[PDB]
Enzyme design. Structure first.
Site, mmCIF file in Angstrom:
data_model
loop_
_atom_site.group_PDB
_atom_site.id
_atom_site.type_symbol
_atom_site.label_atom_id
_atom_site.label_comp_id
_atom_site.label_asym_id
_atom_site.label_seq_id
_atom_site.Cartn_x
_atom_site.Cartn_y
_atom_site.Cartn_z
ATOM 1 N N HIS B 41 50.010 87.416 67.441
ATOM 2 C CA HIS B 41 51.297 88.046 66.493
ATOM 3 C C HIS B 41 51.072 88.708 65.438
ATOM 4 O O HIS B 41 52.001 89.170 64.788
ATOM 5 C CB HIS B 41 52.132 86.756 66.395
ATOM 6 N N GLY B 143 50.830 82.535 56.182
ATOM 7 C CA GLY B 143 49.605 83.137 56.117
ATOM 8 C C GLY B 143 48.367 82.275 56.746
ATOM 9 O O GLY B 143 47.134 82.647 56.697
ATOM 10 N N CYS B 145 47.932 80.873 59.747
ATOM 11 C CA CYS B 145 47.715 81.338 60.924
ATOM 12 C C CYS B 145 46.311 81.696 61.249
ATOM 13 O O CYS B 145 45.753 82.388 60.502
ATOM 14 C CB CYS B 145 48.824 82.331 61.692
HETATM 15 C C1 ALD Z 1 51.610 82.163 60.661
HETATM 16 O O1 ALD Z 1 50.599 82.514 59.345
HETATM 17 C C2 ALD Z 1 52.905 81.366 60.175
HETATM 18 C C3 ALD Z 1 52.524 80.319 60.031
HETATM 19 C C4 ALD Z 1 53.773 79.249 59.705
HETATM 20 C C5 ALD Z 1 53.480 77.941 59.216
HETATM 21 C C6 ALD Z 1 54.675 79.928 58.792
HETATM 22 N N1 ALD Z 1 53.411 81.711 61.715
HETATM 23 C C7 ALD Z 1 54.722 82.438 61.961
HETATM 24 O O2 ALD Z 1 55.225 83.068 60.895
HETATM 25 C C8 ALD Z 1 55.103 82.362 63.237
HETATM 26 C C9 ALD Z 1 55.120 83.667 63.913
HETATM 27 C C10 ALD Z 1 55.673 83.870 65.365
HETATM 28 C C11 ALD Z 1 55.689 85.210 65.830
HETATM 29 C C12 ALD Z 1 54.860 82.689 66.375
HETATM 30 N N2 ALD Z 1 56.670 81.979 63.239
HETATM 31 C C13 ALD Z 1 56.878 80.776 63.006
HETATM 32 O O3 ALD Z 1 56.190 79.893 62.982
HETATM 33 C C14 ALD Z 1 58.342 80.700 62.804
HETATM 34 C C15 ALD Z 1 58.496 79.841 61.237
HETATM 35 C C16 ALD Z 1 59.712 80.293 60.449
HETATM 36 C C17 ALD Z 1 60.851 80.537 61.087
HETATM 37 C C18 ALD Z 1 59.797 79.444 59.239
HETATM 38 N N3 ALD Z 1 59.023 79.238 63.480
HETATM 39 C C19 ALD Z 1 59.484 79.614 64.731
HETATM 40 O O4 ALD Z 1 59.957 80.850 64.998
HETATM 41 O O5 ALD Z 1 59.988 78.521 65.312
HETATM 42 C C20 ALD Z 1 60.690 78.688 66.667
HETATM 43 C C21 ALD Z 1 62.283 78.460 66.243
HETATM 44 C C22 ALD Z 1 62.952 79.471 66.100
HETATM 45 C C23 ALD Z 1 64.331 79.762 65.732
HETATM 46 C C24 ALD Z 1 64.930 78.566 65.591
HETATM 47 C C25 ALD Z 1 64.169 77.202 65.976
HETATM 48 C C26 ALD Z 1 62.432 77.418 66.155
#
Ligand code: ALD
Ligand code: ALD
Ligand code: CL
Ligand code: CL
Ligand code: CL
Ligand code: NA
Ligand code: NA
Lengths: 305, 305
Positions: B41, B143, B145
């Site tokens: 991603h 960050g 990831c």
């Molecule tokens: C990468 O560094 C980062 C680490 C996290 C600890 C923030 N991951 C992401 O940004 C990740 C990218 C996606 C494309 C895989 N997104 C998420 O982890 C995201 C976190 C945000 C919303 C705080 N979570 C997510 O989308 O969970 C699924 C979801 C969506 C909507 C409602 C419930 C669950």
């Protein structure tokens, strides 16, 4: 998000660990520049340990009585000296992996990472706190002496602890890297006891801020307290007194969360008097006191090294 | 003695971490030999993440769209490919710090160490378990990831986890190093839920053996149980079933302590039905399930690497 008992990355210290053998006793040493530091009781027999005269024992030792092994490489000892409870062995080769480092004496309540080693090789890494009674609750087996505790500051390794002994309670005692014990202990096998341990109040409050930052808020209440009134309760539950300096150090966490330090004290007060009622805080049924305020800021802001 | 949540020494992994930037998104990569692995991603915008077509997105990317930085050194990308949910970037220089390594997919209940990184630099190291619902309870910020989980076997690093996302509950999900998620999750920002988590029974029993080894014995009782009867109770408290394989794996701890596995099950049974009565086990008011039987043997026999 999330909150874990996090240790510092250990690679900078791994590259400093060596094996020191004198006679039949083997423990770990710390190889910085052209000096190896290790616990002085390496020069004892199994029989000497009751009440050794380390001055006398060291005088009878020559440089070649100390076998220092970095991995498989054999280091040549060209000098030996005693500083308090640690031996300083001079070797003929500077460690090429020597990090930028400092020796520091930490205060009760402060945390550090322990790189547990045997025979000069790492077994594991874990975080812990210097208890108020100058012991640590570690995980140490025979041969672990000379394992060190440390913090990292950007690129500088601050060595604060060298492991020497275990007291009957499963509690651990050691020195700073200048050889002076934390607490009243002595490196001989005569009866010794740690004395009254207490809970590190400022750290518990830190951890309650950590819980708020990570979404656990059930313990926030409408009440407030004065600093003296809080310490009246704290003393009753064998919590260390909270000082104005502690309040100041909690300042940034109070600003980030919007919860005044004395309001969080009032929440802790109610927890102490009423318990948790089978509730948990950051997955814990007990109040956690091995995180400093800076540990919380580091982990929750993602500080790197 | 003593028992701590111990992580593996992290130096071998520290030397593999790099920073991968595509567009405005920066995360961590794992540099082994002449390949950098990172979450796919990284090729998304903030807007793509709702339902990206990664095949399409990668096709529009050229080698020079991937900025790979090892410390301050700049690595040249000469190839890029996608394997499931991870990107494999081919670089023009093998990592000189590449350890002996393997990629492995762990099973629910097994533990590993996480080297939490930001911008390719280590922040900290901690131990955790793959939950039965294929999530982990980590500590990860934006960050993070591309941070990896791993075990060490003598000299071989077994990489088992690469971090990708956080679900609303503060719970964390990721892949193995072949790019396949643990659990039913997908790397897009559509609603997802972990599903029923349970307690890792075989690990709790491991930890009860650890307590005995370290002198906490108050929970040993005169009762005994059959394996089926124990699982009748376990299921009621949302503990994973104990299998004959679990019994066999607990064998060596049972032999070291002299406490048959089913006698320890009987002790756990009483703890589940009656609680601890404000008592603690290895300093804990709750039953701990993030130690495997081998974790207990390692730490209590001082295994090194
Ligand atoms: C990468 O560094 C980062 C680490 C996290 C600890 C923030 N991951 C992401 O940004 C990740 C990218 C996606 C494309 C895989 N997104 C998420 O982890 C995201 C976190 C945000 C919303 C705080 N979570 C997510 O989308 O969970 C699924 C979801 C969506 C909507 C409602 C419930 C669950
Ligand atoms: C060094 O690797 C080793 C680590 C321990 C975890 C075993 N330390 C020692 O062997 C140490 C050497 C002495 C000379 C400092 N001795 C002890 O730590 C010793 C442990 C034994 C008895 C299990 N503890 C000790 O002597 O404590 C003082 C004491 C003596 C008698 C009664 C109560 C307390
Ligand atoms: Cl006041
Ligand atoms: Cl607890
Ligand atoms: Cl049976
Ligand atoms: Na008062
Ligand atoms: Na039955």
């Amino acid at each position: 998000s999330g909150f874990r008992k996090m240790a510092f990355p250990s690679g900078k210290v791994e590259g400093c660990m060596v094996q020191v053998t004198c006679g039949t006793t083997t423990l770990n040493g710390l190889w910085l520049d052209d000096v190896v530091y290790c616990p002085r009781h390496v020069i004892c027999t199994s029989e000497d340990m009751l009440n050794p005269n380390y001055e006398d024992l060291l005088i009878r030792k020559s440089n070649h009585n100390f076998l220092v092994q970095a991995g498989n490489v054999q280091l040549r000892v060209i000098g030996h000296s005693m500083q308090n409870c640690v031996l300083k062995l001079k070797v003929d080769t500077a460690n090429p992996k020597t990090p930028k480092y400092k020796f520091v004496r930490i205060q009760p309540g402060q945390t550090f990472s322990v790189l547990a080693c045997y025979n000069g090789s790492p077994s594991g890494v874990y975080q812990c706190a210097m208890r108020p009674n100058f012991t640590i609750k570690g995980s140490f087996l025979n041969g672990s002496c000379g394992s060190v505790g440390f913090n990292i500051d950007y690129d500088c390794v601050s060595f604060c602890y060298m492991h020497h002994m275990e007291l009957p309670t499963g509690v651990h005692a050691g020195t700073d890297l200048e050889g002076n014990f934390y607490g009243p202990f002595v490196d001989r096998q005569t009866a010794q006891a740690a004395g009254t341990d207490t809970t590190i109040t400022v750290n518990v409050l830190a951890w309650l801020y950590a819980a708020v930052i990570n979404g656990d808020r059930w313990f926030l209440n409408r009440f407030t307290t004065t600093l003296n009134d809080f310490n009246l309760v704290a003393m009753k539950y064998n919590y260390e007194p909270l000082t104005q300096d502690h309040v100041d150090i909690l300042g940034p966490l109070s600003a980030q969360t919007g919860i005044a330090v004395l309001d969080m004290c009032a929440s802790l007060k109610e927890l102490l008097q009423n318990g948790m009622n089978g509730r948990t805080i950051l997955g814990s049924a007990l109040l956690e006191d091995e995180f400093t305020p800076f540990d919380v800021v580091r982990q929750c802001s993602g500080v790197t090294f």
